Each structure stands twice: as C-alpha cells, then as structure tokens.
Amino acid sequence: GLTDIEPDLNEDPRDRWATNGVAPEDFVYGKYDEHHTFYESSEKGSFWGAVAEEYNSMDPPTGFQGLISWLFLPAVAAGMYFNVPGDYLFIGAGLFVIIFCIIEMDKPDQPHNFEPQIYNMERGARDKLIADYNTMDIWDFNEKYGDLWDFTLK
Amino acid sequence: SFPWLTTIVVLPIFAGSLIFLFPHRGNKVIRWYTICISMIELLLMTYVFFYHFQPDDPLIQLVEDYKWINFFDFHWRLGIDGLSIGPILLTGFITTLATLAAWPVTRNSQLFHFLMLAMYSAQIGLFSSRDLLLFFIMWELELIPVYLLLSMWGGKKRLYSATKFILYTAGGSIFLLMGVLGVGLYGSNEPTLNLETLVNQSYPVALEIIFYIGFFIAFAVKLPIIPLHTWLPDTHGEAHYSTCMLLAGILLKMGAYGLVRINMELLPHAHSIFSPWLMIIGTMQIIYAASTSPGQRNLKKRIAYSSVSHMGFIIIGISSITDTGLNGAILQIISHGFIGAALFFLAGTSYDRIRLVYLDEMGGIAIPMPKIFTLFSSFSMASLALPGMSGFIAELIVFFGLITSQKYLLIPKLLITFGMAIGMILTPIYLLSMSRQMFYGYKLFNISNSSFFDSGPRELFVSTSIFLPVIGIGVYPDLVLSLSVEKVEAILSNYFYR
Amino acid sequence: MEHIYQYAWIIPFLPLPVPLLIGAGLLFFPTATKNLRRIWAFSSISLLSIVMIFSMKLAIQQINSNSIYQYLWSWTINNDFSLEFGYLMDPLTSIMSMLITTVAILVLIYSDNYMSHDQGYLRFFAYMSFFNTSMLGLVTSSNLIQIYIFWELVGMCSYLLIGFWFTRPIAANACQKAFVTNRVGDFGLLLGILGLYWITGSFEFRDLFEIFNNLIKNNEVNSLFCILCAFLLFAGAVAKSAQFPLHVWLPDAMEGPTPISALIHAATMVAAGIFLVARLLPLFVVIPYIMYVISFI
Amino acid sequence: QLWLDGPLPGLRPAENKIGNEETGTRTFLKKGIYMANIGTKGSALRLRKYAFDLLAMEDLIGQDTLNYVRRYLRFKGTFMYYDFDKVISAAPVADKPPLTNLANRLFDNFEKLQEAVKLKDVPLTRSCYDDTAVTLQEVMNRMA
Amino acid sequence: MAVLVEHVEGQRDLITHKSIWHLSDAAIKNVYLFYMMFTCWGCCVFGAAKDPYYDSEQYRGDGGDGTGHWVYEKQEDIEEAGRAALWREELIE
Amino acid sequence: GGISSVCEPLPPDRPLWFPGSTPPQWLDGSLPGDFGFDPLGLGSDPETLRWFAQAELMHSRWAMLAVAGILIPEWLESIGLMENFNWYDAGSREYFADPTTLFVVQLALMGWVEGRRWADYVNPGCVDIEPKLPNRKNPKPDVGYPGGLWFDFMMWGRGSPEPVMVLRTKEIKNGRLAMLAFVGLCFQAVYTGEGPLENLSRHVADPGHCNIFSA
Ligand code: CLA
Ligand code: CLA
Ligand code: CLA
Ligand SMILES: CC1=C[C@H](O)CC(C)(C)[C@H]1/C=C/C(C)=C/C=C/C(C)=C/C=C/C=C(C)/C=C/C=C(C)/C=C/C1=C(C)C[C@H](O)CC1(C)C
Ligand SMILES: CC1=C[C@H](O)CC(C)(C)[C@H]1/C=C/C(C)=C/C=C/C(C)=C/C=C/C=C(C)/C=C/C=C(C)/C=C/C1=C(C)C[C@H](O)CC1(C)C
Ligand SMILES: CC1=C(/C=C/C(C)=C/C=C/C(C)=C/C=C\C=C(C)\C=C\C=C(C)\C=C\C2=C(C)CCCC2(C)C)C(C)(C)CCC1
C-alpha cells in the first residue's frame, strides 16, 4: 500500500516460514472460516435470472457485435462438422476479428483509458475532457488540449 | 509459391511501425489495433500449420531463399519442420495473450505495443530461420525491446535488471557470433551459412568441440544453465508480468531450440562428447534451483528459480541421446511455456491488488480473491508434475528416455534417475509453502476489497485459455509429440553407426 | 457375460461431470452455481449410486466365474516408445470398488447435513466426487503408469480436502505436510516403477510378474536391484497407508472435516497402500527379503 | 566405465539368417529401441504378446492413420525380430528350420505391409495385413 | 480378433481386449484450429468486457497505470511532495 | 427469510387445464398439481377430496415405481446387461416360491403398513415412527407426507431447496405422467406384441406408419 506518514519500523523479528494469518487462539471458529455463516432463505432467486445478471454485469457486446460474438463459435463448430472448406472458416474468423476490433475502436473512451495524470485532474475538467474527446475530431482535440499531455509542464 | 513465412515474420513489426501514425490519446485504439494484428497473425500461422505443414515429413518445409548479401553468401532463408512449428505456435499464442493481459498499461501504450509486436516478429523470425547469420540476427533483435520493456514497465529494481540482462545476453551472443563465424567459414571453397548444407559437414574433433563450446556458452546464457543463470532471477522478478510471459515462456525456450537445431543437429560428435557432462549439470541445476526457491522471500524470484529448475529436465532430455528424451524435452518446452507465463501473470495481477512483495506478509488473500487462488493452486499443481497436466507426462517421458538410453550403463542411469527424483520432492516443498504463505490463514481485509477486487472476465479468460491446453496435453500427449516424432528421429539418425 | 465388462469405463468417469460443472460454474458463474447447492449433492449421490449398482453386478459376476477381463488401448504411439491405458477387472478391483462406493455414498449423504451452514458446500462435493473418480480409476488401473497417475491424483484430492478451511492455520500446515509426506512415497513408487520397467520391459501386471519370476529363477538379474525396487515400491504404500516411518501425516489429516476423515483416511485412501501391496504380492513373493520387511513395518 | 564414447551401436545383425537375402537386414527395423534382456522364455512371452499387439492393429488401418500403422509396425517389428532371433538361437537344432521359415514368412509379410502403407493404398494394406494376421496367429499358436 | 485368452495353472484365466487406436493428424489439426479460433473469440469478447478492478477508482485513483513500479514511485513522490509542501509553506510564511 | 415448511396455495389466477374457463369452487389451489380440472365434480365433498388426494398420491408413487422398474431393466436388456428380461412375462417366471404363497405373504406384510397408513389418515399422529429423542422436537407432518429418519432421510422436504408446494406438484405431475405411461405400456404389451423401447424405436423411425393404426 501507500503511506502518507512514515510507518513504525518492526523492532521484533518474525519467522519467515510461519503462516501469516491470525493466531489459532485468536481464531473465531465457525465465523472466520465460513462454516456456520450460511443460513438458507426462502428468498432465493431464479437460476436463469442469476445467469442473466452475471452475463449482463460483464457488459456484453450488443447488437451486431453481440450477434457475431454469439454466433462465431457455433458457426465454426458446424463448419468443421459439415466438412466445409477451412479457408472459408479462416476468412470468417479474420473478418470477425477485424469487424470486432473496428467496432471497439468506434466505442467511446472512458476516464480509465488515459494516463494517471489525466485521471487525477479536477473532476469537472476531466469530465469536460472526456466529453470533448468523444465529440470532436482527434486533430482538433490535439490542437486544443495537446499541451495537457506534456507532463513536465506542471 | 506464396511467401508464407516471410509474411508471418514481417507482418507484426510492419504493423507496429504504423502504430505511430495514430494521433489518438489513451490506450483503447492502440491496444485494439495491436490485438487485431496479433489475432490476424495467429490465424495466419494457424492456416500455415493446417494447410502447408505436414507432421509426417522429416524434411524442411515452406522454404524461402532470397540472397541478401553476396559477400557472406548470406540469404534470407526461412523454413519450418516438426521442431519449429510447436515453438512458433506457442510464440503466437503466448504473445497474443500477453498483449491481451497488458491492457491496464496507460503509460506509453504506443511504444509498449510496438515493442510487443517487434518481440512477436523477432521470436517468429528466430524460430523459422534456416540461415546461421539470420539466426544470429534474429537472436540479437530482442536485446532492445526487452531492455525498454524492463526499464519502462518493470518493478523496483528494473533498471539494474535491464542492464544486467542486456550485458549478459550480449556476452553470450558474442560467443554465438564467433561460433557462427567459425562454422560459416569452414568451407574450403566459399563460405556457407545454410543449415541444410551444414548438417552434412565433417569437422575434426577439436574444431568441432571448439565450435560446440562457442555455441553452448550462448545457449547456456539464454537457456539458464548453472552457473550462467544469475541474470534470470532479477530480470524476471523485476519485469512486467506481460513481458514475463514472453521471458519465461518463449525466450527461455530459444536456448533449447538453438541447442537442438545447432548443437544437437549440426555438431553430433561434439554433442555426444559433451552430453554426459550435461546430464550431471542438469541434475545439479534441478536440485540447486529447487533448493534456492525456498530461500527466496520474493514470490516472482521463487517462480523464476522454479523456471530454472524446470529447465533441467529439458537439459536432461537433450543430453540423453534418445528419441524419447528429445520428445520429452519438446513437451517440457511447451508445458513450461504454458505454466510459467500463467504463473507470472497471476503473480502480477495479484500484486496489482495486494501491493506486497515478500511472502511473509501476504496471508489471507484467498478470502477477498478466491478465483485467483483457484488458478494459482491449479497452475502450482501443473508445476508440481501432477498427472492430468503436461508437466507430469513431460518429466515421465524424460525419465523413460534416460532409462531407455544406450549411451549410459547402469550406475549413472541410477544416480541421475534418483537425482531428478529428489527434485520432485523439493518442488512441492516451496510451492505449496508459497501458497501457504500467500493464500492460507485469516486476515481482516477492507470492505472495499469485498467487491471489484477479484480477477475480471479478461484475467479469468487468460488463465483458463492457458490452463486448458495443459489438461489437453496431460490427457493426450500426442497432441504435441505427433508433430515432432518424425523430425526428432532424423535428428537421432546421425547419432548411430553409419 | 462379456457385455458388462465392456461398459466399465463408465465407473471412474461417471462422477466427473459434477466436479467439472461445479468448477466451471464457480470460476465463471458463482451465484448461479451456488443457487443449486443441494441439487449438486444429490446429483453426485445419484451418480455414485449408479456406479455402486454397476460394481455390485460386476462383483456378483466375478464371484461365480473363473475369468478376469482386461481392456486396453494405445495411449501413445511413438517411434521409440508406446504407452497403454485400460482397465482390469479382477476380484481385488471388485472388492475395492464395492468398498469405495458403499462408504462414499454414505459419506456424501452425511456431508449434505455436516456442511449445512457452510459456504464451501459445492467445492466440498466437487472435491469428494473428484476423489471418487481418482480412486475408482486407481483400483481399476491395469498398468503401473495408470496406478501412479491416480495415486498422485488421490494425493492431490487429499491435500485439497485436508486444507479445506484454508483460513485455519493448523489445516494450512497439515495439508502441505500430508502432501509432502505422500510425495516421498510417490518418489519411491516412481523409482520402483522405472526400475521394474528397466528390468522387465513392461507395465502390465501379469507379464511383469511372469518376466520377473523367469529372471529370478534363472539368475538373470542381480538380487540387490530387485530388493531395492521392491523397497521403493513399498515406500509408496507405507506413505499412503500412513505407516512407519511416514505415519506423521495421518494425525494432522484430521484437521479437515470429519466425512473426509472417514472416507479418505479410514476406508479408501489409506487402503491404497494395502491395495498396491496386494496387487504386487506375486512380485514380492519371489523377492527374498521384502516380505520380512513388510511384516516388520 | 560410465558411458559410451563413440557413436551408439546400430542394428545388430541376426545370426539366424532371418533377414532379407539380398541385404541381410529387414526394412522395418528401427535403431535406438530399448529391448530388455529377459532370456528365451521372456523373449517367447514378449513375442506372443507383441504378436497379439500387432493383431490389435485392425482399428489403426485407415486412410488417415497409415503413418501410425507404419510406426507401430516398425516398433513391434524390431521387437519381435530380435525376440525371434533370440528364441531361434536357443531352440533345439531340430526345431530351428521351421522357426526360421516362420520368421522369414512373418518378416516378408511385414515388408509387404510396410510397402503397402508407403504407397497409401488401403485395400493393399488390408490384404497384406490379413496375410500378416494369419502369420501372427500361427506365431502365437507355435509359441504358446 | 484383438482378443487374447491366457490360461495359467493355479491362476484364473485372463481375457485381454486390445484396440490400437490413435487420433489422425487431421483431427489434431482440427483441435489446434478450433483452439486458435476459440482464443481469438475469447480475446475479442473479454477485451470488449469491462474490468472490475483496473477501471475502478481504487486502482486509477491511487495513481495506477498498468506499470509494475507505480507503487514505489508514488510513495517516493508523495514523500518528496510533502517535503516540497513544507518548503512552500516556509517560503510563504 | 428462513425456510417455510407450510404449503402455499396457488393464486386464483393460476394456469388451468382449459384456459379461459372458470375453475371449480372446490379447487382453490391448496392441493399439489391444482389446475382446476374436475369436469365431473368428483371433488365437491372436502372429505372425499382429501381421500381422493391421498389416493392420487398413492397411485402416483406406485406408478412411478412401476414405470421405473419396467423401463430401467428394459433399458439394461437392450444395452445387454440383462439376459432375458420381459416385464409382461415376469409374473409367470419360476422363483423360489409359488406365486400364491408369495402373494399371501405380500398381502400380510403390505397390509401391515397399509393400515398403519390408514390409521394415520383416520387419526393423524396416532402412529409415530420418527424417534422421540430427549430434546429433539419432531415437527408435525402432513397426512400422506410423513418422514423423519426413514422416509425423509434427506430432509429435502419441509422447505429445503424447493418450497414444499413446488416439490409436491413436481411429484404429483411426474406421478400422473407415470400412471398414463403404465396404462400405455399395459395396452401396448397386448396390442403391439412387443416391448416398450422396441415400440419407441419403430415409432421414431417412419412415424407416419408403425402406429396405433398398423398394430
Ligand atoms: C404418456 C405418454 C405416452 C407416450 C409417450 C406413449 C408412447 C408411445 N406409444 Mg403409447 N399409450 C399411452 C401413453 C403413451 N404412449 C396411453 C395412455 C395408451 C392407451 C390407454 C397408449 C396406447 C398405445 C397404443 C395402442 C400404441 C402405442 C404406441 C406408442 C407410440 C406412439 C404411436 C401411437 O400410435 O400411439 C398413440 C396411442 C394412443 C392411445 C394415444 C395416447 C396418448 C395419451 C392419452 C396422452 C399422451 C399425451 C401427452 C402429451 C404425453 C407427453 C409426451 C412426451 C412429453 C412424453 C409411442 C412409442 C403405438 C406403438 O408403439 O406402435 C408401434 C401403439 O400401437 N400406445
Ligand atoms: C389414480 C386416480 C387419480 C385420482 C384419484 C386423482 C384425483 C384427483 N385429481 Mg388427478 N390425475 C390423474 C389420476 C388421478 N387423479 C391422471 C392420470 C391425470 C392425468 C390425465 C390427472 C390429472 C389431474 C389434473 C389436471 C387435475 C387433477 C386433480 C385431481 C383432484 C380433483 C379431481 C377429482 O375429484 O378426482 C377424483 C378421481 C377419481 C375418483 C378417479 C375417477 C376416474 C374414473 C372413475 C375412471 C378412470 C378413467 C379412465 C379409466 C382413464 C384411463 C386412462 C385414459 C388415458 C384412457 C383429485 C385429487 C385436480 C387438482 O386440483 O389436483 C389436485 C386437477 O386440476 N388431476
Ligand atoms: C419422482 C419424483 C418424486 C418427487 C419429486 C417426490 C417429491 C417429494 N416426496 Mg415423494 N415419493 C416418490 C417420488 C417422488 N417424490 C416415490 C416413488 C415414493 C414411494 C417410495 C415416494 C414417497 C415419499 C415419502 C414416503 C416421502 C416423500 C417425500 C417427498 C419430498 C422429498 C423430496 C424428494 O423426494 O426428492 C426429489 C428428488 C428425487 C425423488 C429424485 C429421484 C430419486 C432417484 C430416482 C433415486 C434415489 C437415489 C438413490 C438410489 C438413493 C440413495 C441410496 C441409499 C439408500 C443407499 C418431496 C415433497 C417426503 C415428505 O413429503 O416429507 C415432507 C416423505 O418422507 N415421498
Ligand atoms: C376423468 C376425470 C374426471 C374427474 O372429474 C376428474 C379426474 C378424476 C381428475 C379425471 C381423470 C381421471 C383419470 C384420467 C384417472 C387415471 C388414472 C390412472 C391412469 C391410474 C394409473 C395408475 C397406475 C398404477 C398405480 C400402476 C401400478 C403398477 C404396478 C404396481 C406394477 C407392477 C409390475 C411391474 C412394475 C413390473 C413387473 O414385471 C410386473 C408387475 C408386478 C405387474
Ligand atoms: C409408455 C411408453 C411407451 C413407449 O413404448 C416408450 C416410452 C415413450 C418411453 C414410454 C413412456 C414412458 C414415460 C413417459 C414414463 C414416465 C415415467 C416417470 C414419470 C417416472 C418417475 C419415476 C420416479 C421415481 C422412481 C422416484 C423415486 C423417488 C424416491 C425413491 C425418493 C426417495 C427419497 C425421498 C422420498 C425423500 C428423502 O428425503 C430423499 C430420498 C431418499 C431420495
Ligand atoms: C500445444 C499448443 C496449443 C494446443 C493445445 C491443445 C491441443 C489443447 C487441447 C485441449 C483440449 C483438447 C482439452 C480438452 C478438454 C478439456 C477439459 C474437459 C477441461 C475441463 C476443465 C474444467 C471443467 C475446469 C477447469 C478449471 C479451470 C479453468 C481453472 C481453475 C481450475 C479448474 C480445474 C476448476 C495451442 C493451440 C494452445 C497453441 C500453442 C501450442
């Protein structure tokens, strides 16, 4: 981690090979180990609802990108089962890769995509930066906020 | 007719040279373009392996010969066989996955991805080079990218590690160049550097021994051989984990590939002279690194010394003059390229959350981070030569190659078989202890570490996609061996009476 | 008659889908997998019940018959080497499979209520079913390589199950201690297997026994190497059955949960050494001093 | 002595005239295969077992897996060649001519099967392997 | 056919079923090809996915940049910045 | 919040056997598998409704056991692990005893337990089999759904994984399917003159023929 204040140095030595957990006499058995901490509940959600929630939480591709990402692997498996020529499979895989990457390039940029200096500026200024970067052309952005990327200026 | 191998070598570096035409900021467009190039190149190698590589052919395939310099009789010559296609596919797979795992890099993303594509091109050019000076050039072509990656995206001691790495590799590679000059100038009429015509060359015993030493010093600097291994612990420990994939999965196997292609194939008599002394060195390397690993408090240094220990089985399979030993060496090359890269990746991703180095202060990580615990345990089991994984079958085939070997008689065959056995007693002793000092026990963690702290979909996919071939080869080893059973036999065909 | 044996590959590989699906889900879809807790346990119980019914029919057939059925396949085809994998159904295998299935189904039923309030329920049952798969593969193994494969897999499952509560430091030490103590025996067993292959040239039990008897009776091999290989083979049985001097892992193996204590260290895993010695008993009979060593140990 | 100094020994010629008449050796022999020394009884047991192993090769014969047929044929052929040499060399003098004739016929069948595999001809491979099969059954019947 | 029965005096007879089977090289190439396409599909899909930790404020807010040495450099930077802040405060006063 | 061990009646807008129709007033969704199907009004009397529910449960369980014991041995015979199985001819086989004395012994043994069940239905709690341990409290079971140590050694009822109503409708639905299946098997064994799985095999192939209309 990071300390804003110089930490107290370790006066007493510690065994290298010892386990780094708490002492066995300080261990709250049944709670620290999850052995008696699961009490059931009538309020259990649907299995397929949980599947859908977990899939949607990953932020899947949507639309044509979602369609091709869903239909790529079954199409490849069917083409290999039906003994269709493999050159068509390679053409389809390359087209899928290029289309997916181009679509992902077309997607708007987020604050986490930039340098830590850009991430850790004023939040309003950062919001204006992100709003402009996804709106105007890259040349106008570079001629307007270019000097913000000279990290030695400040 | 089409230059497949030339296109495969040229495409990544040529595409990465155009990464500086992008005026975009951030890393999104750069990383997506780089992964597009990597996946297109991977599909290209897949097409080449599927449609133009024949595993039953012991000869060179897809050869391309373009004269570049007349004075050295030096040709851009490319060609693949059963020995090279495995490392080529492993290089493509590991480099694409290392590009995918290097996505949080926001500082100098353009240069990072350009260096990744340059490393792609250089490794592929080495693994498919049929000219000695071209082999040397592709060998040298990675000193600068790895140096920059270490010095700009490494750890705390990255600069000293990078300096030590580049100086050690240059010190080995000057002996490599001296060996290249000696072999390529032995021709009575004109100099020649093609490996095909050099495989039939006859040398005196002393000159062959000198050339073997000149090549072996370089191949012992690169592939870690005691005591030329000291660059590896600080180089791999203080490197980026994405770069650690290439360092411990691809670049380490290049020394072994050079040992098979040059020391084992071009100079068989000197190799037969040197191999019994290589067996003892490999066994002592296994024992020495498996004993150095418990002494390392740093996690990445322990993994690096584990890699040094695992290279000893490759050395044994090289030195044991059998087809089975060479097949086990190739299988261990593939297994270690699948295991060490994933272990380094998991170590780096875990450090990105825990932000601790020494093992005696990282208890209880299994409570906020269970999935990375599961992947770390599974890849440790793969490191442990556990059956169902590629490591066990690789070590077993190496053992069989020693037992079936005709060069050694009885007692050394015992004292080496016992030897590596001690290694597979020492290999648990630190590894599980590592896990016991990295995941077991209870620590009170922050509430913010309860969510958005474990490995995401990308890291889970990377670990799963490297773990699946391990199981697939541990169940059916002939998914790999059948690519190189023929060519290895040809390599062995020069070691018997003729 | 010969139909039942043909379809006996299903015996080790029938529990396997439950650990496969539990691992894949718990690594990818954790909440959805954990929504089916007792369903997973009953699926494991039903699969083990099917395996137990097959094993009972096999045992009944084996009692009133004078035939042993072996099935083999070529695992590896190389120019210099060739490996085989298959299953052998002799009365020892039937006895062990009955013992394993009968104890393990009751252990699964018990574990349904033992881990009623635990959160590692699915991981627990996946570990148990994978151990059942490994042990059933071990008892039906036909060659020494397969024996060693499922030997080490069973040891791995024991290591995972002993240190089940990884937050407990005593179990944290105990699992590693058990794995290292069993790995000493694995080292001995592998050395013995390699020595037996060098002496004989085969991994099949019957051919190796006949070759070793022919070699010993005609004095075509030195006795010291045979005794050394026998002692190395017996070292693995000593370690896995927790005998002197490798008995230290067994008391620490009880830091795991009690159904693991029962199934692993009471009926099945500790019986692997007895199974291996009984399997290699025709080999140990002709070897001079190894029976006295076994009795003394 | 700890290790051999020169090149590894090659195919040792058989002393029972079971090789080819023109060459003195068989084409399917592979150098570098470890043969365990058991004796005449062990060689007979391995001969019968490996004849059964080669009669287990019906499934491997196909348009896509002829290379594995050739590999298994070379491996087992070297093994049974040297086992046949060992058992003929220790056979009684009255039983040596029939054993040598049987070995010669079996190895001619091996050569014909390898030749059929080389041309990638599947019906020829099947017919040559059927002749090899009846010869191998004769071998196990003799050596039971 | 591929079945051998051995009888041993004083022992139970054994019936051995054998089948020399191996995957064709075409099947192995199919396995390699499908794994390459699966790797490409997964790279695309799980690169398009969101990263829970590396896009979070817990990582980027502390100064993380995907670089392995940002923690030590950030620590030395904040000590140097504290000393420079003391120097600034003494200059102003 | 915890585990509810009481059956929850279905809402009045539950799916019905004949959608768009009015469910009968005596079928309020409190019974397992309640779909409002009573054209003849046989369940108008609540006492006869309880008796008919218990009879349906008994027929369901016996039919599921029956169809399992027909199909699984038949599936084993087709696989080849049963030499001469035939469920139609199973009653006329040779056993260690005559069918008549076996029937009398079965009558006595089964009329013990069927009669203990009768006493439980008439007087709930009059016969208790679950042990009365010193401080364990035995929950009161529903009539027709008993089970502590013996009949419910899994504790899958009483609100565990799926609520009691859900599992009871699952049981009743599988039971109805099994009753229909067993009656179909009984008619097929005398109509087609063949086995069940054989009839399924000749129906799956060319289903336009090999039907009820071609014997
Ligand atoms: C419960 C489901 C059920 C199922 C899946 C089958 C299945 C089969 N029957 Mg059987 N059968 C049943 C009940 C069932 N039967 C009943 C209740 C009776 C009479 C009381 C019969 C009497 C019977 C005869 C007389 C014959 C078959 C035959 C066959 C085949 C169909 C072709 C046909 O002509 O028969 C249709 C026959 C009927 C009398 C229709 C009964 C349908 C009932 C009332 C309802 C089932 C519907 C419901 C949606 C089931 C779900 C389907 C699926 C999800 C399980 C098929 C293998 C034929 C055969 O195999 O010839 C080669 C044939 O000859 N069956
Ligand atoms: C074994 C006998 C049996 C019995 C006693 C019951 C009893 C009951 N049923 Mg169930 N049921 C059965 C079998 C049976 N069912 C079968 C086979 C099916 C699928 C077709 C269903 C489907 C079903 C539905 C969809 C519903 C019920 C419901 C009801 C309840 C109210 C209706 C009534 O008063 O029943 C009194 C019943 C009897 C006394 C039986 C009389 C039958 C006559 C005398 C002759 C039998 C007819 C004939 C021989 C059929 C041959 C088979 C056919 C394919 C040719 C009651 C608990 C309702 C409910 O609320 O659930 C609780 C409801 O909605 N049942
Ligand atoms: C077909 C499905 C079925 C279903 C869903 C139910 C559902 C219900 N029953 Mg009923 N029951 C059935 C068939 C079924 N029953 C049969 C055939 C009988 C006659 C024996 C009974 C008689 C009965 C009794 C006497 C009791 C119940 C009870 C219950 C509850 C327990 C949950 C359950 O059974 O597990 C759902 C899952 C299954 C049924 C899976 C099928 C089982 C497979 C085929 C075999 C079991 C595997 C293995 C061989 C067993 C372990 C081996 C061990 C003995 C060594 C639930 C409300 C209990 C009750 O209501 O108390 C509240 C009660 O004690 N049932
Ligand atoms: C109409 C109406 C009207 C109103 O309104 C309403 C309602 C009532 C609801 C409706 C309906 C009705 C119905 C349809 C009914 C049906 C029923 C059934 C089907 C039953 C069966 C049922 C069935 C059952 C129990 C069954 C049983 C069986 C058994 C035991 C068996 C036995 C056996 C076996 C196994 C085998 C062997 O080898 C032989 C034997 C020995 C022989
Ligand atoms: C007819 C025909 C004709 C043609 O030919 C062909 C075809 C088509 C195939 C056919 C059809 C068929 C059908 C459909 C059938 C169905 C069935 C069923 C439903 C069954 C169940 C069945 C079912 C069953 C057995 C079940 C059972 C159960 C049980 C025992 C239980 C137990 C238990 C309990 C209680 C409780 C606890 O806690 C637990 C336990 C212990 C676990
Ligand atoms: C050499 C090579 C390669 C190949 C490979 C292969 C050929 C593979 C295969 C594979 C296979 C053919 C496989 C199969 C199967 C598998 C399976 C069946 C699995 C399962 C699993 C599960 C279910 C789970 C798991 C897990 C995870 C993921 C982690 C954690 C732990 C656990 C264990 C839970 C490549 C292309 C990469 C490239 C480079 C070179």
Q: Say whether F27 counts as a known binding-site residue.
A: no
Alpha-helical regions (H) of chain A? 47-57, 64-81, 86-106, 116-119, 123-133, 138-144
Is the bond leading into C245 cis (omega within 30 degrees of zero)? yes
Residues of E in contact with D59 (CB under 8 A): 2, 19-21
Query: Torsion angle, CA of B436/B440/B442/B446, rounded to 10 degrees?
Result: 100
CB C239 within 8 Å of CB C192: no
Which atom number of ligand 6 is nearest to the Cα of residue B334? 1
Q: Which of D97, D80, D67 is nearest to D132 (CA)?
A: D80
CB B143 within 8 Å of CB B115: no
Q: Please provide the DSSP assignment of E24-53 as one string.
A: -HHHHHHHHHHHHHHHHHHHHHHHHS--TT
Are residues D32 and B492, on separate chains, in Cβ contact within 8 Å?
A: yes
CB C287 within 8 Å of CB C227: yes
Q: Rounded to an integer, what distance in angstroms lies between the CA atom of residue B100 and that of residue B462?
A: 8
Neighbours of chain B (3+ CB pairs under 8 A): A, C, D, E
Tell me the backbone φ, ψ of residue B146, rounded to 5 degrees: -70, -35
Distance from CA of C164 to the nearest CA of A (A): 10
Element (H, E) at C69: strand C67-77
Q: What does the angle CA B327 – CA B83 – CA B397 come to, to the nearest 5 degrees?
A: 5
Residues of E in contact with D56 (CB under 8 A): 2, 18-20
Are residues E17 and C71, on separate chains, in Cβ contact within 8 Å?
A: yes
Q: Please provide the DSSP assignment of C165-189 as one string.
A: STT-HHHHHHHHHHHHHHHHHHHHH
Strand order across the E13-19 sheet: C82-89, C67-77, E13-19, E3-6
Direct distance between the N- and C-terminal alpha carbons of chain A, in angstroms, rounded to an integer = 26
Distance from CA of B456 to the nearest CA of A (A): 8
Nearest by CB to D71, which of C77, C215, C218? C77
Q: Rounded to an integer, what distance in angstroms lies between the CA atom of residue C197 and that of residue D96?
A: 31
Secondary structure percentages of chain A, helix, strand, coil, to 5: 55, 0, 45
Q: What does the angle CA F137 – CA F141 – CA F147 come to, to the nearest 5 degrees?
A: 85
Is C234 buried (19+), middle (13-18) or exposed (0-12) by CB count in 10 A? buried
Residues with CB under 6 A from ligand 2: F 17, 27, 31, 33-38, 42-43, 52-53, 55-56, 59, 176, 179-180, 183
Phi-psi region of D10 (alpha: psi -120 to 50; beta: other; left: phi over 0): beta
Q: Which of B3, B150, B108, B104 is nearest to B62 (CA)?
A: B3
Element (H, E) at C229: helix C223-240
Q: Say whether F84 counts as a known binding-site residue.
A: no
Nearest by CB to E20, which of D59, D67, D140? D59
Distance B79 CA to ligand 1 centre (A): 66
Q: Rounded to an integer, what distance in angstroms lies between the CA atom of residue B198 and that of residue C166?
A: 58
Does the Cβ of F168 fall within 6 Å of ligand 3?
A: yes
Distance B423 CA to ligand 6 centre (A): 26
For testing the chain C interface, which of D28, D34, D41, D72 should be mutated: the one with the most C CBs within 10 Å? D41
Q: Which of B388, C72, C69, D79 is nearest to E21 (CA)?
A: C72
Please report the residues numbered 8 through 37 in chain E whose beta carbons come closer than 8 angstroms to any beta carbon of chain C: 8, 12-22
Which atom number of ligand 2 is nearest to the Cα of residue F177? 19
Structure resolution, Å: 3.2
Here the tokens at position E68 are 């392995």
Residues of A in contact with E49 (CB under 8 A): 58-60
Q: How far is CA B87 from the centre of its chain?
A: 8
C17-28 and C121-139 are packed helices; what angle lies between their axes, rounded to 10 degrees? 150
CB F35 within 8 Å of CB F14: yes
Residue-level length of chain B: 498
Residue B131: strand pairing partners: B194
Interface B:D, Cβ pairs < 8 A: 46
Here the tokens at position B54 are 């024949």
CB-based touch F/B (3+ pairs, under 8 A): no
Q: What does the angle CA C186 – CA C187 – CA C189 come to, to the nearest 5 degrees?
A: 60
CB D41 within 8 Å of CB C214: yes
Q: Say whether F47 counts as a known binding-site residue.
A: no
Say yes or no: E6 contacts chain C, CB-CB below 8 A: yes
Does the Cβ of F200 fall within 6 Å of ligand 4?
A: no
Distance F13 CA to ligand 2 centre (A): 21
Q: Say whether F171 counts as a known binding-site residue.
A: yes
Q: Which amino acid is at C166?
A: F
Please report the residues numbered 132 through 191 in chain C whose beta carbons come closer than 8 angstroms to any beta carbon of chain A: 165, 167-170, 172-173
CB E48 within 8 Å of CB B457: no
Residues with Cβ within 8 Å of residue D76, at least 6 apart in sequence:
D50, D53, D54
Here the tokens at position A70 are 């869903």
Are residues B489 and C150, on separate chains, in Cβ contact within 8 Å?
A: no
Distance F66 CA to ligand 5 centre (A): 8
Q: What is residue F92's DSSP assignment?
A: G
Are residues C120 and A34, on separate chains, in Cβ contact within 8 Å?
A: yes
D96-118 and D122-143 are packed helices; what angle lies between their axes, rounded to 10 degrees? 160
Say yes or no: E61 contacts chain B, CB-CB below 8 A: no
Say yes or no: D42 contacts chain C, CB-CB below 8 A: yes
How far, CA to CA in Å, does E53 sit from each of A127, B30, B346, D141, E57?
A: 21, 21, 14, 71, 8
Q: Which amino acid is at B42?
A: L
Q: What is residue E15's DSSP assignment?
A: E
Residues with Cβ within 8 Å of residue B433, at least 6 apart in sequence:
A17, B294, C176
Residues of E in contact with C206 (CB under 8 A): 6, 8, 14
Element (H, E) at C73: strand C67-77
Q: Rounded to an integer, what distance in angstroms lies between the CA atom of residue B481 and that of residue D68?
A: 12
Distance F184 CA to ligand 1 centre (A): 6
